[PDB]
Amino acid sequence: KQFHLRAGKASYVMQLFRSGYLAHVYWGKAVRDVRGARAFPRLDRAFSPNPDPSDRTFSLDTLLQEYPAYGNTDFRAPAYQVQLENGSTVTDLRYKTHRIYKGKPRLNGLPATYVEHEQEAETLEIVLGDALIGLEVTLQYTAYEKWNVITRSARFENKGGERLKLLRALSMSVDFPTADYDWIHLPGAWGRERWIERRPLVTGVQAAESRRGASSHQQNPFIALVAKNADEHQGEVYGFSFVYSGNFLAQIEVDQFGTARVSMGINPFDFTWLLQPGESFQTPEVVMVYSDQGLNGMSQTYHELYRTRLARGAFRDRERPILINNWEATYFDFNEEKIVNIARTAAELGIELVVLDDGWFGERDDDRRSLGDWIVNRRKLPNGLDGLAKQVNELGLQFGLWVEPEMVSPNSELYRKHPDWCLHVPNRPRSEGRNQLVLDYSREDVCDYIIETISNVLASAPITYVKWDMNRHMTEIGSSALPPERQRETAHRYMLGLYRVMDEITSRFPHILFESCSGGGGRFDPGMLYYMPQTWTSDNTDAVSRLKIQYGTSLVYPISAMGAHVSAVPNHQVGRVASLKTRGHVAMSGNFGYELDITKLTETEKQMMKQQVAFYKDVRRLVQFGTFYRLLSPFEGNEAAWMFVSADRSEALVAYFRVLAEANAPLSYLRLKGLDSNQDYEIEGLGVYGGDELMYAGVALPYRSSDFISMMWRLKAV
Amino acid sequence: KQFHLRAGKASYVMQLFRSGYLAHVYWGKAVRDVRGARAFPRLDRAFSPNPDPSDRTFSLDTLLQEYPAYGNTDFRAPAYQVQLENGSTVTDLRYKTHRIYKGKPRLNGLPATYVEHEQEAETLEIVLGDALIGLEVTLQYTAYEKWNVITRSARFENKGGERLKLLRALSMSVDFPTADYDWIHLPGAWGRERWIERRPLVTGVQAAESRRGASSHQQNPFIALVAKNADEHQGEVYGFSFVYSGNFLAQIEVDQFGTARVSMGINPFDFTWLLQPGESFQTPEVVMVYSDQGLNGMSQTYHELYRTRLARGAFRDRERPILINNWEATYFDFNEEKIVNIARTAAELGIELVVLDDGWFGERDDDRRSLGDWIVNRRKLPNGLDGLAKQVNELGLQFGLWVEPEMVSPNSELYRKHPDWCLHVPNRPRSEGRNQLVLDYSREDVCDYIIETISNVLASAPITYVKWDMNRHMTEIGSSALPPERQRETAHRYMLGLYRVMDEITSRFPHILFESCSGGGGRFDPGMLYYMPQTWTSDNTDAVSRLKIQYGTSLVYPISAMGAHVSAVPNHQVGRVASLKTRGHVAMSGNFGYELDITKLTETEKQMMKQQVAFYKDVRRLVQFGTFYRLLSPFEGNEAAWMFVSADRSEALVAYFRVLAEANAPLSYLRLKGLDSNQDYEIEGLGVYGGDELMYAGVALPYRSSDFISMMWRLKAV
Amino acid sequence: RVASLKTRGHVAMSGNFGYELDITKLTETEKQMMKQQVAFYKDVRRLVQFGTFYRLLSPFEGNEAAWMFVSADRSEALVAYFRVLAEANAPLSYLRLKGLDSNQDYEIEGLGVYGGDELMYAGVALPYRSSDFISMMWRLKAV
Amino acid sequence: TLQYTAYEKWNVITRSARFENKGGERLKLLRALSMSVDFPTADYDWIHLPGAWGRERWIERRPLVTGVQAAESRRGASSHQQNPFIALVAKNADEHQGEVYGFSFVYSGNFLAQIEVDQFGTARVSMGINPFDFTWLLQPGESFQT
Numbered sequence A, B: 001k002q003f004h005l006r007a008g009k010a011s012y013v014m015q016l017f018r019s020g021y022l023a024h025v026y027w028g029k030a031v032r033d034v035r036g037a038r039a040f041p042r043l044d045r046a047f048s049p050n051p052d053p054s055d056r057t058f059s060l061d062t063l064l065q066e067y068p069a070y071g072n073t074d075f076r077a078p079a080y081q082v083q084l085e086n087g088s089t090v091t092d093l094r095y096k097t098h099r100i101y102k103g104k105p106r107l108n109g110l111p112a113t114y115v116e117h118e119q120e121a122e123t124l125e126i127v128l129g130d131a132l133i134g135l136e137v138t139l140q141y142t143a144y145e146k147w148n149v150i151t152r153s154a155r156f157e158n159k160g161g162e163r164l165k166l167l168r169a170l171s172m173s174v175d176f177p178t179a180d181y182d183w184i185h186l187p188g189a190w191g192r193e194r195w196i197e198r199r200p201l202v203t204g205v206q207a208a209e210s211r212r213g214a215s216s217h218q219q220n221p222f223i224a225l226v227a228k229n230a231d232e233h234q235g236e237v238y239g240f241s242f243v244y245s246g247n248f249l250a251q252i253e254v255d256q257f258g259t260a261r262v263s264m265g266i267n268p269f270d271f272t273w274l275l276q277p278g279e280s281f282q283t284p285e286v287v288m289v290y291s292d293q294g295l296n297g298m299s300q301t302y303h304e305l306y307r308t309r310l311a312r313g314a315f316r317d318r319e320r321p322i323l324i325n326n327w328e329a330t331y332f333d334f335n336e337e338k339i340v341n342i343a344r345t346a347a348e349l350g351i352e353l354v355v356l357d358d359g360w361f362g363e364r365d366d367d368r369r370s371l372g373d374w375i376v377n378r379r380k381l382p383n384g385l386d387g388l389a390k391q392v393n394e395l396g397l398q399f400g401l402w403v404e405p406e407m408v409s410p411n412s413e414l415y416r417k418h419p420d421w422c423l424h425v426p427n428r429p430r431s432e433g434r435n436q437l438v439l440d441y442s443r444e445d446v447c448d449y450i451i452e453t454i455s456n457v458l459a460s461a462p463i464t465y466v467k468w469d470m471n472r473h474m475t476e477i478g479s480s481a482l483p484p485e486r487q488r489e490t491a492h493r494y495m496l497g498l499y500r501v502m503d504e505i506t507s508r509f510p511h512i513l514f515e516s517c518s519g520g521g522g523r524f525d526p527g528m529l530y531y532m533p534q535t536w537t538s539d540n541t542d543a544v545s546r547l548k549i550q551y552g553t554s555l556v557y558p559i560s561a562m563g564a565h566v567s568a569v570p571n572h573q574v575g576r577v578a579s580l581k582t583r584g585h586v587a588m589s590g591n592f593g594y595e596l597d598i599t600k601l602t603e604t605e606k607q608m609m610k611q612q613v614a615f616y617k618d619v620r621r622l623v624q625f626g627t628f629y630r631l632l633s634p635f636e637g638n639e640a641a642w643m644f645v646s647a648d649r650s651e652a653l654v655a656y657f658r659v660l661a662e663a664n665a666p667l668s669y670l671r672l673k674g675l676d677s678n679q680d681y682e683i684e685g686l687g688v689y690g691g692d693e694l695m696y697a698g699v700a701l702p703y704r705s706s707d708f709i710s711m712m713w714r715l716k717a718v
Numbered sequence C: 001r002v003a004s005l006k007t008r009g010h011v012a013m014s015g016n017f018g019y020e021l022d023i024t025k026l027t028e029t030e031k032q033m034m035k036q037q038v039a040f041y042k043d044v045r046r047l048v049q050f051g052t053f054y055r056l057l058s059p060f061e062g063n064e065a066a067w068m069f070v071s072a073d074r075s076e077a078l079v080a081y082f083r084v085l086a087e088a089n090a091p092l093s094y095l096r097l098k099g100l101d102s103n104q105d106y107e108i109e110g111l112g113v114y115g116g117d118e119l120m121y122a123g124v125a126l127p128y129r130s131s132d133f134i135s136m137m138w139r140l141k142a143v
Numbered sequence D: 001t002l003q004y005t006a007y008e009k010w011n012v013i014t015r016s017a018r019f020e021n022k023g024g025e026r027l028k029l030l031r032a033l034s035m036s037v038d039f040p041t042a043d044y045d046w047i048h049l050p051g052a053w054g055r056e057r058w059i060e061r062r063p064l065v066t067g068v069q070a071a072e073s074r075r076g077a078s079s080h081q082q083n084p085f086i087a088l089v090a091k092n093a094d095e096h097q098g099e100v101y102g103f104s105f106v107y108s109g110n111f112l113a114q115i116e117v118d119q120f121g122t123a124r125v126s127m128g129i130n131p132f133d134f135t136w137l138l139q140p141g142e143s144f145q146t
Helices: A294-309 A334-350 A384-393 A415-416 A444-458 A484-508 A524-529 A544-552 A580-587 A602-623 A690-698 B296-307 B336-349 B384-394 B413-417 B442-457 B484-510 B527-532 B543-551 B580-588 B603-625 B691-696 C005-014 C029-045 C043-048 C118-121
Strands: A003-006 A009-018 A021-031 A080-082 A095-102 A121-130 A133-146 A147-159 A166-178 A182-187 A197-200 A205-210 A219-226 A237-242 A248-254 A260-265 A272-274 A280-281 A286-291 A323-324 A352-357 A398-403 A465-468 A515-516 A535-536 A562-568 A593-595 A627-632 A638-643 A651-657 A668-670 A679-685 A687-690 A699-701 A709-717 B001-008 B012-015 B023-027 B081-082 B094-103 B121-130 B135-144 B149-157 B163-175 B180-185 B197-199 B205-210 B221-228 B238-244 B248-254 B260-265 B274-275 B280-281 B286-291 B323-325 B352-358 B398-403 B465-468 B513-516 B534-536 B562-567 B591-595 B627-632 B639-645 B651-657 B668-670 B680-683 B687-690 B699-701 B709-717 C054-059 C063-071 C078-085 C092-094 C105-108 C114-115 C124-126 C134-142 D002-006 D013-020 D027-029 D033-039 D047-049 D060-063 D066-072 D082-089 D100-104 D111-117 D123-129 D136-138 D143-145
Touching: A003 A121, A003 A133, A003 A147, A009 A593, A021 A095, A021 A166, A080 A121, A147 A166, A182 A205, A219 A248, A219 A260, A237 A248, A237 A260, A237 A294, A237 A524, A272 A280, A272 A334, A272 A484, A280 A602, A286 A294, A286 B442, A286 B580, A323 B527, A334 A352, A334 A384, A334 A544, A334 A602, A352 A384, A384 A398, A384 B687, A398 A444, A484 A524, A515 A524, A515 B513, A535 A562, A544 A562, A544 A580, A544 A638, A544 D143, A562 A580, A580 A602, A580 A651, A580 A709, A593 A602, A602 A638, A602 A651, A651 A668, A679 A690, B001 B121, B001 B149, B023 B163, B023 B286, B023 B484, B023 C118, B094 D066, B149 B163, B149 B274, B163 B286, B180 B205, B205 B221, B205 D027, B221 B248, B238 B248, B238 B296, B238 B527, B274 B280, B274 B484, B274 D060, B286 B296, B296 B627, B336 B384, B336 B603, B352 B384, B352 B465, B384 B398, B398 B442, B442 B484, B484 B527, B513 B527, B534 B562, B543 B562, B543 B580, B543 B639, B580 B603, B580 B651, B580 B709, B591 B603, B591 B699, B603 B639, B603 B651, B651 B668, B680 B691, C005 C029, C005 C078, C005 C134, C029 C043, C043 C078, C105 C118, C114 C118, D013 D033, D047 D066, D066 D082, D082 D111, D082 D123, D100 D123
Parallel strands: A323 A352, A323 A593, A352 A398, A398 A465, A465 A515, A515 A535, A562 A593, B323 B352, B323 B591, B352 B398, B398 B465, B465 B513, B513 B534, B562 B591
Antiparallel strands: A003 A009, A009 A021, A080 A166, A095 A121, A121 A133, A133 A147, A147 A280, A147 A286, A166 A260, A166 A272, A182 A197, A182 A219, A205 A248, A205 B205, A219 A237, A237 A286, A248 A260, A627 A638, A638 A651, A651 A709, A668 A699, A679 A687, A679 A709, B001 B012, B012 B023, B081 B163, B094 B121, B121 B135, B135 B149, B149 B280, B149 B286, B163 B260, B163 B274, B180 B197, B180 B221, B205 B248, B221 B238, B238 B286, B248 B260, B627 B639, B639 B651, B651 B709, B668 B699, B680 B687, B680 B709, C054 C063, C063 C078, C078 C134, C092 C124, C105 C114, C105 C134, D002 D013, D013 D143, D027 D136, D033 D123, D047 D060, D047 D082, D066 D111, D082 D100, D111 D123
């Protein structure tokens, strides 16, 4: 009774134990068969009680499990918890049946990785059931053929005659036989998202989570287990990525016997779900990647999967336009003439898209009003969105628009008419963030209004680009349309509403490239990537600051989705002053664009920016769709380096950065990766060198002074 | 509007902010007055929402709090959470009044540190209230005069007109302004309890907890924050000890801005508490200790407080008897004559107490039956407990008895008669640990039965010693005597029942020395220490294994409560063979005793054991009540060392251990601590040496071969 | 590297103070700054060059660097703090002093009278500043 | 003649040697260090001051290996590369606490600051004029001060 999933060059093995217990066996590099070499001597462990009183060698406290529960002799953190009408939380799920089919199913009202053909992957569904309460839980496993990817999710169903209350419903759980690992998560904040933090495991609970109703800047829904001696270029790494943009829990628990339980899913804190007879609950999925070639190996797998099989729409495989956003340039102080003034200068540079940011609607001259009133400000924009867009188009440039549909200002016509459409609880003060409130997307009437309202706006002008922003986190979570026993479903139902709203709007406008945003990387997660193929990385547009941010972000997400804009100096967020050359090279390492007043630059500055746009277009296909390698970490030292290699290893682009200068510094060298050692590559401006020489010996770096310096090399095989 | 508590040479500072917000200010070395030198620049932090929309610089996400909540702009883990009838979990507590009085209050139905006179400490009660729901929360602070001890606890009271459901009720919470700290907790298992684990903090959640309905071998209810450069002998250390024997949560959360939230209390997992209007809830307390003299400084504070002001009874300040237990000696295979045979041999050695272990009652010839039937086995003990005790007494020895009143075997008359007296949930299989079940101590009838039954047993013979054991952990938590809405109160109510049972029995028999036990240190916590002045440290009686176990245990608990027995070889738990001399030196470093068949030992062994008993009696008052210093850690290397110093520094005892021998090893040296540098000390058998020499230069350690060696030194001031 | 004149002074004032640049080609802003600089160091030349020196934060370990000069009678002190690299939405800091009198109240010129124990056990809150290469300097006088 | 001086006010010990040829035959000094001291244990870190021009005297705190660690100059000066100063610090010592043993050379030429950990965990700290490319001819009646 053994299940063996084959995902790329990896294996995932499970087996049925005794009477319908599902046990974890092996996850790692592909083996032809697990015959039992690494057995599991079942022992009578002290204080670990037995469900079967006759056999003291069996306890759920000592069994490596796929979807464990609490109360039936297991004392470790459960993957799920159900409360009965009698008050008891004891549930025992045992094997019922299973099915195996080619392909991968869609998840209801949720984003998930997909396939274009059934032959791309195989899906295993293991059905568990609790006979007493009529609870059925179907565990979904999918293994891709081409990649080392394993996806897991769960579906609950009440086939009984009583109501069941889900106190906790995590997406997955896995028990490693050893705890000798480090773990990596991505802590951060606004302006500094997704910094890499590697630490050795401790005996107890280590966890990253979000209670903010969104993925968050503070913790990204991603954790990884790494071998003690593993690095960027080698070693075993086990990644876990959550495809969900709301509250989450990412937890690793090490027990008394040195096993490590990794569980991930919707945060059980402040969460319940009521299942009336006939009702079901589908959890979001988690994408698991194994790699023996280190962190770069894992990252590259995620990059291909998320770019080709997560992102959707017409722009999935299309090169992304170089855009200009006016946010840091004008903020709220702008007019129609100012925008067209910027559009003409952008046209001279070769910029392809002009994006109109916040402040175009209602009475928006500040961030204290007008959210929810989505109608053109005729004072700022006399000819409306139609006129402005048309004026940009005749310059041969696309036009884009900024929106924040999930929010409503207390000072707005929408709120005066429908004050109860926001998230709130009875008789409690309504707290505000950035002087705005969150709309109740758990209500159908609200969602319907938003879908139609936004559709009207997008159909009023030739808009080919949309920036969806979110600048606040939920407080006073509650809905007037929900009964008391369903109140704790508000946070999740909110996200389900948003997902529906986005799917409908994006469907009505397939010619529009959507870029998700949340004060930067507030919701940079696989969930949002499913609806909008690219994301605004961070509101911190400083070149040096972006080194850490982009390095950390590239750990999971593809470069194609990583937005990067060249901004003004001194930087608005940090104050730092870095050269336009250095500011360019960092931004070119992601989805390239500009965010600054281009009407105010010198002809000397216009010439360099002109060269930048021209250069990036040449390497655009390489950067956005090529293979990414991280070389030097800004978290570990004074340097940062990475490179892009084409699929056929015939083309390459190398970027190097050094932040702090010191006098009489020793010489530097950089070894490359991902090239073909049997081929010679011409480094433009230097000469032809062997791939083996470039990777094994390295390249001498030029001695250079001042702080925050950059250099870039294009490589082409002979 | 500032509260400043002074506990010994430490300070604890709070202050009211705006409209009744209670904020944390400072905890550390005593300062005469906090004027604000270390201010707190109030900032507008991105995505941190505002309770007052006019002021963006105020958020509960950025405010250091004493008892924080979630949902009112705070996103970090709350100290408490309340669910209303409308389904909302939003609660707003604000200042109402406060009270200050000399002394320390008793906690309702709970153990807590005490005072014998009001002037020993001062108590501050801060009363908070939520006007909407009529919820009142009284925060209790107590500061001792002579020690750096701060105790914290909370009391909820429902003064509203609806029922309130407590989802979480922790004892305390504190926000450190920085997160640059390591943290220490005590992970373990059966046979290896309380190993010391020091680790650097991570950005996220670090937690040690118990879901077993007991303190546990796996995690001890203690955590501490330590400065990066702090050690055993220096640096700032902040300890947190939970006075509770049930489920607990000890958690440290580091947020985006580098603050550290330390929270401790009853585990919110599988826990709710219903407050009908007019009902109250008292949380257990947490003992907070500050020390700038390193880990030993903190430990020594805990030792005096717990020994003199936590432990109770006639044996609080009295020397503890050297005992012999027959468990490892005979197990279940013994009779009346066998006990007297070991009792006679014990008399020759100088042993003062003979303890009859498991197997004396019902039909218990194995561990599968008879729990709950507490009547003498007349086949094994013809003359009963009465006859046996008197037979021991006429040899001049005390008599003791083993009991496990919290458990019932399915195979017993008690279970046949009252099958519903156990902990269970409807229509679910009743899981067993060690073939036994847990009695429902949340029921008053059950508690009443045990009190009467055990009292009858205890009054049937001249018993002056009792070992209270529990060899199983709770599963299927539920009570048939509780309504569905109170079902999740079972675990806590169970402990409240037990506490009542223990308090009543110990009151009826003040002449009996009680030793708590739970398969060793399963319940080694301040809660049990309040009822029983000593505890059985571990079922692992190996000398080398005990090095780690006792070292870790001494971090919080006093040596007087730390039981240690000399056992047979090869060891029953690990297999190791170590000299009788070394087993003694390890055992003499705690509460000394013997556990092996003394009728079967060689004359060579009889000579040493005779000498050991003689020796320990001389240093008994010094060991159990003297000051303890740790010198070498078995967690850090191949050696372990510690020493006992008298209060007046005129007497000392030093113990040294080396586990693994290597050939041609270098010479070793040991430096002492806690002595008076201005006095000369005679090392018995060596010579007179200066205290300054012994501490600054050190003592030469003996060159020796073979494995597992020990040495002991007595010091006497001239 | 381009650092502020304020910073270049504060670091130089932590030693044998002097100048080395064409002072004839300076802006009146720089000239005015240097006039205040010279007068400042003159007022505490004895304290710096002949006082007790304490290191607090090492530039070989973190992103910060700090030290302080304390007199013989510990009646007067001078604290210097430095931060090199900057980051958005940075966490706040506090610096704990050394070598003071715990039972003596001190007056920090610009802030207010504070206890010696509070400065060593609790610390001094470090102000939020953007930009690279930042320098602060507190002066302490007993009452 | 081994020279030791103990200041009453400070914790300072100064050491130096004075050779003297009171024989009839010539003596050749291949090595003449100012001092040497054998520590009973070697559970220490060690701090020296390496660097170069434009970055003199950076702090390197590293644990002791079971061999020889050396900071020296062969440039006829104290050199920017290695300052004549090494220190034995305890494992748990920082700026504010801990046992620290300093060794400072009063000489502006070629030097050798060397620590040697033997098979028995004993540390020998040596400091003086660099023996490399150095000899001193002592005629009968002559002397040499370090």
